[PDB]
Amino acid sequence: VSSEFYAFKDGKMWEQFAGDYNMFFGEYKPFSITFVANAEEPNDKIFNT
Amino acid sequence: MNVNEFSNEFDVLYNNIMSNAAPGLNEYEKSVLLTKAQEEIVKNYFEPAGNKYGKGLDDSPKRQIDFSELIKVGEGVLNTSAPTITFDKRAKVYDLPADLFLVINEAVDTNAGTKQIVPISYSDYTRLMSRPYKEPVKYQAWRIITTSINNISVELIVNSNETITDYKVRYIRRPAPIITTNLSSEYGDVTINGVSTVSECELNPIIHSEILQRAVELAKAAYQGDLQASVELGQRSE
């Protein structure tokens, strides 16, 4: 709407990208990032740190 | 240093100044490495050729204070319960203490008098038994090890016409393990030397630094995984 992004859930309008971090619709949701670690993949490695 | 200090200070040395930069050891692994390190330190500082100074048990004040809390005096018990066979006709079998690591002085109290025991090698026994008399000198007795079952059995070859009334043994007691936590709490049934609970160091604080440094070196070698490092630091295992 104009120069701002909005969302509608549970009968209320939620302005996006304006609240506190990691708070979706008043609830805290976690964040994560997964990445495969395969360097020199024929070799067997002990993953340490 | 309490066990908590051995664990906390392993990570100021092994783990790149507690930076989690090196691999990371559990408390069971640290306990195992500390136990192995203390055994290695005892063995190296006992033999003069095993350390860097060429000095053995009683060759300097530092060495005397190192083994001060291991030296124990105990009596041998006659092994008359088991009617075994002795290699010498006049050998009275005696059982030694169970917590025995290295013997350094033995004496036998006879009716004639106290006699210092000489641990006689298998060559000297054959040499001295090829002669006319075949008895020790007036102020000494011989000792050779015999058939032993889950213990240490010694034949005391004292001169004939004499009876043994006592047998005192001064030895280095077997060190107790170093354990930094109750192993059963997180690791199922792992024991270091049969004890699963916290075990402090039974040694003088003077060599605690030596033991910790040796443990750190052993950890770094076991983790570098090179065969060369393992065989190089395996030299000092004796």
In order, the DSSP letters of B55-80 are --SSSSHHHHHHTTTTEEEEE-EE--
CB B53 within 8 A of CB B45: no
**Cβ–Cβ below 8 Å for A48 and B21:** no
* Nearest residue in chain B measured CA to CA from A48: B23
Distance from CA of A46 to the nearest CA of B (A): 10
**Are B20 and A49 within 8 A, CB to CB?**
yes
Experimental method: cryo-EM
Q: Chain B: nearest CA to A48, how far in angstroms?
A: 5
Min CA distance, A23 vs chain B (Å)? 32
Cα distances (Å, whole numbers) of residue B167 to B84, B114, B227: 20, 9, 47
Inter-chain Cβ pairs, chain A and chain B, closer than 8 A: 8
Residues in chain B whose C lies over 2.5 Å from the next residue's N (breaks after) = none
Q: Closest Cα partner for B141 from B124, B125, B160, B158?
A: B158
Residues of chain A contacting residue B20, judged by C-beta atoms under 8 Å apart:
49
Q: What are the chain A neighbours of B14 within 8 Å (beta carbons)?
A: none
H or E stretch covering B101: strand B100-110
One-letter amino acid for residue B128 of the chain: L
Q: Distance between CA B25 and CA B22 in Å, rounded?
A: 9
Q: What element of type H or E holds B4?
A: helix B3-10
Spell out which residues of chain B touch residue A49, defining contact as CB-CB under 8 Å: 20-24
3-class DSSP assignment, residue B95:
strand
Rounded CA separation A6/A2 (Å): 10
CB B45 within 8 A of CB B64: no
Q: How many distinct helices (H) and strands (E) make up chain B?
A: 7, 8
Q: What amino acid occupies position B10?
A: F
Helix B3-10 and helix B27-46, axial crossing angle in degrees, nearest 10: 100
What does DSSP assign to residue B132?
S
CB neighbours of B33 closer than 8 A, spacing ≥ 6? B25, B215, B218, B219, B222
The 3-state DSSP class for residue B173 equals strand
Residue B175's Cβ-count burial label (10 Å; 0-12, 13-18, 19+) is buried
Rounded (10°) CA dihedral B12, B13, B16, B21: -90
Q: Which residue of A has its CA nearest to B20?
A: A49
Resolution as reported, in Å: 3.3
Rounded CA-CA distance B193/B174 in Å is 11
Residues of chain A with Cβ-Cβ distance to B24 below 8 Å are: 48-49
User: Which tokens is B81 given?
Assistant: 């319960």
Question: Rounded CA gap, B140 and B159, in Å?
Answer: 9
